[PDB]
Paper text:
Like other Paramyxoviridae, RSV has a non-segmented negative sense RNA genome that is coated by the viral [name] N to form the nucleocapsid (NC), which serves as the template for RNA synthesis by the viral RNA-dependent RNA polymerase. The structure showed that the N-protein has a core region composed of N- and C-terminal domains (the ‘N-core’), with the RNA bound in a groove between them. In addition, an N-terminal and a C-terminal extension, called N-arm (residues 1–28) and C-arm (residues 360–375), invade the 5′ and the 3′ adjacent subunits in the RNA-bound ring, respectively. The NC is a flexible helix, with variable pitches and numbers of N-proteins per turn of the helix.
Here we set out to determine unequivocally the handedness of the helical RSV NC by electron tomography of purified NC-like ribonucleoprotein complexes (RNPs). The resulting reconstructions showed that both MeV and RSV NC-like helical RNPs are left-handed, with a pitch of 52 Å and 68 Å, respectively. A composite subunit was assembled including the coordinates of the N-core and seven RNA nucleotides most closely bound to it, together with the N- and C-arms of its immediate neighbours on either side. Although the close contacts of the N-core with its neighbours are scarce, there are a few key contacts between N-core atoms, in particular the interactions of the Arg234 side-chain, which links three consecutive subunits. Thus, Arg 234 from subunit N−1 makes a bidentate salt bridge with the Asp221 side-chain of N0 whilst simultaneously hydrogen bonding the side-chain of Tyr23 in the N-arm of the second neighbour along the chain (N+1) (the subunits are numbered in the 5′ to 3′ direction of the RNA along the ring). Modelling the helix using the COM of the Cα of Asp221 and Tyr23 from protomers on each side of the subunit as the centre of rotation about the radial axis, rather than rotating about the COM of the whole subunit, resulted in a model for the helical NC with minimal clashes that preserved the inter-subunit hydrogen bonding described above. Superposing the N-core of one subunit in the ring with its counterpart in the final helical NC resulted in a root mean square deviation (r.m.s.d.) of 3.9 Å between Cα atoms in the immediate corresponding neighbour, with the largest displacement of about 8 Å. We have demonstrated that RSV has a left-handed NC, a feature that is in common with other Mononegavirales. The most important implication of this finding is that the 3′ end of the RSV genome is located at the pointed end of the NC, and not at the barbed end.
Author numbering:
A (entry chain C), B (entry chain B): 2 to 371
The structure:
RNA sequence: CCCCCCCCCCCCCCCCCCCCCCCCCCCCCCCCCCCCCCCCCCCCCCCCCCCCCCCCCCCCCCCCCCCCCCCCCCCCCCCC
């Protein structure tokens, strides 16, 4: 029969990669700091010091942010997530030791984490510069409140909030979203910026952009931290910020998949076009594949997953054009750097999409009027 | 087919968070006091001492309130709810020891709980100041009745009654409801304020506001206590008041969800508007998601649950406007700090909603008249 | 290379208390068993017999095209 001549390449390609006999393990490096729950409270203090510091140096805040995320996970878990990702990890412990150094003649004590990635010499400078800003703050308002100080439990998550904004715009993969990351960090997190002088969206976002670029394994650590953080029963409003901002990243690097359902929902006439209908057999395979993966496919582009290319609709020129045209006519895209392969289908879809959104008459058949 | 091009993001996002391989555990601190049933009666006495004290210092009453709630749960259960919430707990026992101290020269005995969070030095001062108010009360009325004294079993729940009022207005998350908490504590719980001089709604509410802010894990303990308290077969009228005041918190931080059903019930014409109907596919998903969760979604904003953002209708500008307008026209909102994204839909919905509530004619078809 | 060790607190015990006590042999009857009839077997009958190797042709496969991605967006706020 002619019904039998078929070949499910999409399912077979997945079967090949899923049943690999051998494994590659990428060079994570010489060592990774794996802090446990006992240090979490010290890192939150370190995160607070950077936040209270006016015009703070956020060169290490991307790294310090990851240390807080790993301390929340705990040494056992964060090692487990690195090994499950596919990395040989040389686990370095993290705890508190008292360092004595004579700054400006007078001998001073400092509680420092003995980290491999972060030197004890730069850790004291974060505390030194924070004490300067603290006494300046204390001189201005007399008594500093619990909100404005570094001891607040939000401090650690406040730094991870803009980390979730950075992870939201990692799909582009060229620090192009930085403008949107800062923009949202002013619309969102506005109360937090009032109570902390050193909440600099541009400076902190670039730090997280740097640490995710330099260390691709830490983006896997943050994503699985964010999912673990979002799996909790309840916390604070700042943790509610992080959870909401983190879930905005879900479905990044695959907007054409969502806009394709929109074109189907609004019933754009150019979907029924002949050349678009020729592709419909294969576009359903990727949508069914997206339905198969489920929640797993959300961070397939944020984490540069090999199977992220399978979710692409760009391989279908005609369907992509009408979907990208529908988005243009409804006026939801811009400045989206996706170009339609078929320009005629794009313009026709844009024209009909503009006609769909016109005027606004009341539909009385929807209501249960007697 | 074009019916297959779909993607249930709401269900897949839940599937991602529900199937997390790893877990985060937040720094609960150095230690938590986990009192058992044997101390419950001592804390009730301590709660009574604060209530009989005229112009009492309710600095520790928020913490003392949590200790009574945890004593009612019992060491085994309160440890279980902290671990299920996602917290590493260092359980400190709570029981009675006799402390001898010479106040004003004369050596005096005091039954004190050896708590970590509460010092033995401040515990005796609660008893000392209560004895002053007790003898002043005894001098005025001669013989103090069972209602006015600290030994009454209601004392512990009376302090937790305004804790339920604080939890009712935690959705705002900025002590803005304090005015309403004091207001309702005067309308309801009025008989209790007559029999206790130290029932200060403003002072006690601020104490619970402080302890929930400083310790986010205790708000999880109180919510699960209130549900466990509400699951009882029956009790006193004060316990009945607490159960009623606690269930008023159910559905906090999601009033737009309830007002949306009201607009559908009253049949506001602006629901059938074109731009509102475009959102109807996605607004049903969140209502069906709210129906899926059931009783679990009640305290999703009180407990700052990551999945609380999923219940938001604010993401839909047009539907939110007509729903917020319907509430304005019926005259049920105010001073609600929610602003409509679409002003024209809000005004049109408000206008029709005002026309719905006019006059009042008798409908004789409703009755079974022969 | 570096480096004594040690250091507190503390007899134990203490009360109350014999046990036992009654009633009661057992058994007793009836009753050998068996008994008859009866060897078994007997016939007929080797089996087999023919025909027949199998195989034989034709034929590498393959060859094109193609990263992906890029937008926007915390939530909440009343009353009871």
């Amino acid at each position: 029969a002619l019904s039998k001549v078929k070949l499910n390449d999409t399912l077979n390609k997945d079967q090949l990669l899923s049943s690999s006999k051998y494994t590659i393990q990428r060079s994570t490096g010489d060592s990774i700091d794996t802090p446990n729950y006992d240090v979490q409270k010290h890192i939150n203090k370190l995160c607070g010091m950077l936040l209270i510091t006016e015009d703070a140096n956020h060169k290490f805040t991307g790294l310090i942010g990851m240390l807080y995320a790993m301390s929340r996970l705990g040494r056992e878990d964060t090692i487990k997530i690195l090994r499950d990702a596919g990395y040989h990890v040389k686990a370095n412990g993290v705890d508190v030791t008292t360092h004595r150094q004579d700054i400006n003649g007078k001998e001073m004590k400092f509680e420092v984490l003995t980290l491999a990635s972060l030197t004890t010499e730069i850790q004291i400078n974060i505390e030194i510069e924070s004490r300067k800003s603290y006494k300046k703050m204390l001189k201005e308002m007399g008594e500093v409140a619990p909100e404005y100080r570094h001891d607040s439990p939000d401090c650690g998550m406040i730094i991870l909030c803009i980390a979730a904004l950075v992870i939201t715009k990692l799909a582009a993969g060229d620090r192009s979203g930085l403008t949107a990351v800062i923009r949202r960090a002013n619309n969102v997190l506005k109360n937090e910026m009032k109570r902390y002088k050193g909440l600099l969206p541009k400076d902190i976002a670039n730090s997280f952009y740097e640490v995710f670029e330099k260390h691709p394994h830490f983006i896997d650590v943050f994503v699985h931290f964010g999912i673990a953080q979002s799996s909790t029963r309840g916390g604070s409003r700042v943790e509610g910020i992080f959870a909401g901002l983190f879930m905005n990243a879900y479905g990044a690097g695959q907007v054409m998949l969502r806009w394709g359902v929109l074109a189907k929902s609004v019933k754009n006439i150019m979907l029924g076009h002949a050349s678009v209908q020729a592709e419909m057999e294969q576009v359903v395979e990727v949508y069914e594949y997206a339905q198969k993966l489920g929640g797993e496919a959300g961070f397939y582009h944020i984490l540069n997953n090999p199977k992220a290319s399978l979710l692409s609709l760009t391989q279908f020129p005609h369907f992509s054009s009408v979907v990208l045209g529908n988005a243009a006519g409804l006026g939801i895209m811009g400045e989206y750097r996706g170009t339609p392969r078929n320009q005629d289908l794009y313009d026709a879809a844009k024209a009909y999409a503009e006609q769909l959104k016109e005027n606004g008459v009341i539909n009385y058949s929807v209501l249960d009027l007697t």
